[PDB]
Amino acid sequence: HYPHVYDSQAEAMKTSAFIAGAKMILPEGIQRENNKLYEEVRIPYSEPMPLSFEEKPVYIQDLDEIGQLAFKGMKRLNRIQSIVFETAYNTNENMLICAPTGAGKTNIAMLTVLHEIRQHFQQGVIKKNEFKIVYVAPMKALAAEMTDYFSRRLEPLGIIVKELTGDMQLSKSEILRTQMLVTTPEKWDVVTRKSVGDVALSQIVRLLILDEVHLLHEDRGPVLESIVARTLRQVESTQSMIRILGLSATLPNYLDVATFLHVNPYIGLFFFDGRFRPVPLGQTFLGIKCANKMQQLNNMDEVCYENVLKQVKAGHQVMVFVHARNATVRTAMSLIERAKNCGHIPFFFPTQGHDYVLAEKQVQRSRNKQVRELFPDGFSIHHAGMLRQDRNLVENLFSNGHIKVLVCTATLAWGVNLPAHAVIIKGTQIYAAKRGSFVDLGILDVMQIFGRAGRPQFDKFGEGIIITTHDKLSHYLTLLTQRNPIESQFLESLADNLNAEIALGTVTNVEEAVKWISYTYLYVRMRANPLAYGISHKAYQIDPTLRKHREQLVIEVGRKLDKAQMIRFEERTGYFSSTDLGRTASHYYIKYNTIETFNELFDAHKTEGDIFAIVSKAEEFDQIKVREEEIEELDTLLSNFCELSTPGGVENSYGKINILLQTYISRGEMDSFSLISDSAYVAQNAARIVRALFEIALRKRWPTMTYRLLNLSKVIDKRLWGWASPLRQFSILPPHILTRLEEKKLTVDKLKDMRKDEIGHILHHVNIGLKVKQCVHQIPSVMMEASIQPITRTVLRVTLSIYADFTWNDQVHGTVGEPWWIWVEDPTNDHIYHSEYFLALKKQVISKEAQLLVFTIPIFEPLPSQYYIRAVSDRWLGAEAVCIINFQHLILPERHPPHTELLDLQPLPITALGCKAYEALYNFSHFNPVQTQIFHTLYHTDCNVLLGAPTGSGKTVAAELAIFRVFNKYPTSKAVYIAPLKALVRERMDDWKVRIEEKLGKKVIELTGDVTPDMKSIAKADLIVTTPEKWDGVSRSWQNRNYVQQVTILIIDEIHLLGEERGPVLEVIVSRTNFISSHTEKPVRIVGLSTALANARDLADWLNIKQMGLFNFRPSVRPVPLEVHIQGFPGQHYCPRMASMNKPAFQAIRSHSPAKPVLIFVSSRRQTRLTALELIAFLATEEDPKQWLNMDEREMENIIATVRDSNLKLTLAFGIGMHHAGLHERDRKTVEELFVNCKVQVLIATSTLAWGVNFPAHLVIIKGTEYYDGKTRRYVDFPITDVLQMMGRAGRPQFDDQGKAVILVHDIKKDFYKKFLYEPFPVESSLLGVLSDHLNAEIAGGTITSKQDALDYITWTYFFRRLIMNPSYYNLGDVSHDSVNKFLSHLIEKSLIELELSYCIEIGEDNRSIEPLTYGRIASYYYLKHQTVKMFKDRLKPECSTEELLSILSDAEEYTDLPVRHNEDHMNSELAKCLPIESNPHSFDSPHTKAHLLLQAHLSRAMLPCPDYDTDTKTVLDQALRVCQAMLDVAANQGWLVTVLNITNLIQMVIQGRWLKDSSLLTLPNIENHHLHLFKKWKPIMKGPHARGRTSIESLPELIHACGGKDHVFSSMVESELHAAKTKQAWNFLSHLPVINVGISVKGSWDDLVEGHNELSVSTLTADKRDDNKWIKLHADQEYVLQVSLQRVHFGFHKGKPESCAVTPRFPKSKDEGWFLILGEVDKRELIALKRVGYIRNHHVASLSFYTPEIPGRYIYTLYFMSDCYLGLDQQYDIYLNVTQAS
Amino acid sequence: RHPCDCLGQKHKLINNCLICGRIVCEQEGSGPCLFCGTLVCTHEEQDILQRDPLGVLVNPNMYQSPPQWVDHTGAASQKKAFRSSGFGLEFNSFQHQLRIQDQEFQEGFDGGWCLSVHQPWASLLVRGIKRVEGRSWYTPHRGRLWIAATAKKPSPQEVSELQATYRLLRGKDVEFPNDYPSGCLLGCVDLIDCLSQKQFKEQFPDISQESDSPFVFICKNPQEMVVKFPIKGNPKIWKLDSKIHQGAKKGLMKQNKA
Ligand SMILES: [Zn+2]
């Protein structure tokens, strides 16, 4: 149909019809002068036609600005640019190009790249990372050349390119920062099949470049077509646009590949021919004809002499090919002797000039001697054997032209562009080890050879010579300028490609497999010619689409793969799933017969020698035959370089492969070039094979085998034997030095311990000794130790503390870090338990901190002697660490007693309660069995009870019954309920207040974290709901105060949460409550409600119950039965995991309950998006697209219109829902309400909101169980109790019959989950971690006197109860009385030592009596810790400035618990700018630094990127205020007043979120500095009078005085710039802000019988005008009391005392209107007294106390009235004391 | 019978009472339930009717011995080397000044401060008969303070006028502990406020006539024990020694036992 209009050469004719028994379309009638000694065809010639007006060249000016800057501006664009620019720079569809010139390829490549970049985004040319384009190159040479070309070509864009070609696995960060990649088709294929990860690249490629697809004809074409099919399938599966631009040189058939490349015939089929090439690249077709190989050799070397003689007659400079580096030398002297013979030197010597002498001296510099003798004549040698320097010399002397002929053995053609006039291929037979037997060269190689025949615009004729024999010359002629269609061989590698696709998960069933076959070029080739591929034309007639043959091939290959256990294929329904073995085989590009041989040969008891036989017998080495020439070298190598036993001898192929591997290990030297190439081939192969086998054995858990395979892999890639010295891997160490070391039999450890000077003396070189010492110190190593924690009788939980003990070197160890494999090896049982990967980071080694890992291994009833925990480096030979863990007399936990049977015969009606008002809060008319049982044991007998009913049983009803009992029997008492979760506290408070506060006549009030507000809160509370920390702070002091003795209940929900880390306060709270109850003789009941506990007996004994209230129920008790299914999803790096559990989640939904409300949780704050889009994309191909849309779409469209989130589209429009940290937490509550009924039908949770509304559901899949963040740089499992409670939310008594849940976790811990998903999890105390802190309170309050009573106090704690039953968990040795009491004494002594080092305790000379200190008392009052008060005392100094107070605020240890999001390091760093102060740039991951940044942002009014920060802000703010006040007290204890004033200013900023450096009036709500000029202008309130004051109202007290209580006759018009939007806010802010005036009178406090003088009132008005009234006649050394009467003056509009709550626009909590007032001197800078007072409703009096120095001096004190919760309302009053002596 | 508490976890069960919701065992049955006294019977049997030493801080435990302290550990051995410093108490120093006299701090923590009051007034102060104390000096310590009996023996005639003064305020209804000690430390009271007489009249005029002084101590409910502490006596506002303070607190717990 003539696609396009440009293509040429559409013409042919018949000339002779016989060219060596073939037809060759003769262009211009060239003649074949075949003779006896050779056969040849003449040189074809082409003449380009003169292009006149068909197209105009493109320039630089007619481009966008990006086009201007990217273009270098040569202003000359060839005809290729003119032809292609319309579609390659404007259109954005797939296209291909094929040119005989690479200059016409690279320009198109980068112009298309720039076109895609500029069309991607307008800001995309400014900001990168929105796309990831990829380039492919044949092998390393062109990849590196293109990488350098792209690095130097495009500087202005800032785009950075890379070259990853079979070198290493690129890191996630590296590809994140990089924007484009360059690789090879094999490397690209392996990296795409291993591209499975948290983030992949194929979905953000957006552009893929292919070059020279002609390789599809010869070899490696299966890889290219496989990757093309992979990217096309990804494109069609992601519904995105990714451009495909193909590139080649010449294709005999181009329509087939065009259809394969998915490009329409008309747009971009631009086929370039020899006519349209710039130069006439003709070539000869010489041949040979001899019966014997010796005469063949003399004949074709004579022919080579003949045409090079013709060339020297022409005079141009030429270059000849050989096949091998060794053979190029013999060809070199053969040509030299030929040139010397026959006397043709007179036509051969190079010309002589000054440049010739320069080249002569330059080569004389070089070491090489062959080039020295080659220079005088016209010969040059080029090879890869000699270093690059001589390659520069030879390439530059070629460039200048001193030389005539060059031999190059095919490395520069791939590597370096140096064109030559005539190119001689010589028809060399490459001994490619992939084929063997000297296979003929491919078409791609020879075509690239002819590519350099045209030297740019200095020669007008291109020539090329081919020399070979008859059949070879005919074969070569048949595929160089003939129309023979390009044929692909995909069936041979079909099994491997199907295995790779199945492993990737893209192909799952037969139909999509057939579609993938259709995508490949093999299908297209089958369409045209079915006979060549085994399909009859009649079979084509019966099925045009050939779908039946595709299905047959797919099922056959699936059968072959399934018989090898690689994939699990089901035919009767038609799907194949990938297995671990198949994934491993695909990842390393292993042929299926190789893994079949593994399965039929490998075992768990192979030695170190038979592994060589196994790897040699594999079939990728089968194309290697032992030859008569190779046998001599092979037997000599076996004689000399052998190191291990080699079964098979030398009479088989695998034997020779084994020998070659063995001699390659020891860096052996060999002669045969073909054997050298074979050695390299088998080296690379056997390396990948041994890596795959190591992975397979590791997955099979074979320790004694995986250790050997890892050592073998290290040996093969390190080129050093196992017994060789580890120092051999360092190139800096001279080899003779290493020989001297090994001759002394020294090892790494001995010389590491042995001091450097002695090793220098022994080796007789001190410098060498120091160098080897600093080198061995760089050898990787790690010191590690394990602690055993027997959680259960069988399941253990060992903790490994590891730390690097080697000096770090950036080059030696690598920037990324050091890899390690850690496995728990058992010698006897011989199967690994929980192998793991570890990475030692830069700061991990530098800081040498003890990295902690925790993992669980199973044990058996017969205790094993020991488990060899082994850590082996994955890259450094001889770097292993073994930590033998003995199992000596470790006490396992006793088997817990069974639960209590649930007896139910008749439900209990609510009328049995006895009070109509009490039962009016319920709706059901009867009690479920749990409440039926607990109705009388609770609320009727008044004894402490522990209930362990499962979730959803209704323990809330038990709490209601207890509260009803408290309200009924003891109305004068009070009730308090404790819940460990803030969300749980909020929801319980909401429920309590809606149900009981308005209905029942009692009082309900929440408690905040401030002791003195809690005084009034608890005065008339009658019901308290508290998170444990607040209640512990309230009850911290009980001895010296008498408000809490009237409470007689403690309802504690989720008591099992005491076991984990953030719930230890429950233990101390219950212990102190029991202590108070026992030491007050007024018992306080305890009601502990939680889920089922296996060890509930210990908790029962803790609460002092014998048989009264022990209520433990089995999980089969809830009204809604729960069914759980077991499933495993094996994987690694969690990369295949999300794809693994996503696939059957929908299948579970349909099988269990389609279109039913279900809540899911997999998102760790990140997986929300991935899960949402993957789910919405997968569900499209189903019978009911709107299955989860049982309601109309109009309410969803309205809701999505109301929702302002940009990602929630297409999810809440569908049935997909979520409730995450976003949507301002209200609209997601609306979607939760929509989920309450059956509308949404599905939602995904973030696993952090598991505690909350607790909306019901039917089917739950636990898809997300692990989480990783910046806490420990590694993934950690969810708590088992957390998972249990979170999954137990399923079920609903009125909308479902039973609850359904399934498990989606990897296989290695699926057994552990199954063990713990049914058996209740025992709960263990965690009091030790903060054991000191609580003790501080108990020693600050006077409850503790000595060390002995401090020890015996701990008996009341649950930790003491649990220690006896589970000793080995708490590192205790033996249950004997001496051992336990010694351990307790040691632990408590360590805690007391830490407390003393924190400046909190005094031990005294006796050392047996501990006295509290003032700092520890302050820490106890403000709910602090030892480690924070210690730093408080350490870094608090006199005369500090506000930034120092902020710094001391930052490092409070209460901020340690602040979490990280694994990404905060970026936003905290970017928000660190534009701030008044800055923190350490290297501590951005520190939680203290994050809290400091948060405090700065809040206090400076800064925006927070992540919404959760706001929540964190509140928490931080709370803590800050607390410690802020404590800070003041510490300063108040020190003596000086400057820091006290600074801390007062700091708390003012905290409560106001401002600074004292700015204006005070900025504290007004919604007021900023930019409009203060409008506030700057000020006239008198009434118009006309002359100004009296400053005519400015900047001062806030001045504003209050001028505006008064009116705030509407003056402030309303002047503040009209706020357009009355929030002027009422400022109105009430000013109205509630009071002004107070004071009057001070000093009165004596004489002891007795003195009475001194009368009261002396000193004027508050500034008095220094030489008056004795100010000079109080004060008697020295007499205590004197300053009575200050401070009264407010309400202007009368508000009448005074509106409320007692101060306005806090920015602070979350509500705080009272305090007032600070201090008395001190300024000359010495110390204070004498400090006071803080609460609300001053109208007037009050404060009584300060102060002394006087004995010196009768006339000095000055000062009283400062400071604002506790305001700004600028502070006043100063100086008192001049004329103190005199007293008699 | 006897209300056995097994709830079916030790033996079999019978019908639970409807009124009280109380699970009843087979140990006691065939009659009214203990809690509410109504007839309750199982279905199979109601069908017939239808047809017609002791440490200061230690709790009782199933342990053979409490966790005594052993000083054999080397960690305390190191501490014994450099614990030579310390044992510094200011005791009764007029130069003492808290300089942080916030009211809320003092009653949270007992600082060991003690005061000496004359026995005729001290007895009524510690028994709560008298509510306000009068002294010339002013004390910024607003926490718990102990009261030490004076060394001088009170005259029997002072109790007559003291009783007569408080007859209108209290009356003869409240019993008076005529046993008056001397030189002991029976007193332990908490202080809430100190202020001048004029402010006392202004804000607290109801009981201001009880006592008049330049500064008035207002003391809330005190505590009492049955044991006697001998103390020599010290001038006003003196820090109690550690040994007596520890013993006094222990006695306070022992009286809290009763
Ligand atoms: Zn019983």
Ligand SMILES: [Zn+2]
């Ligand atoms: Zn009853």
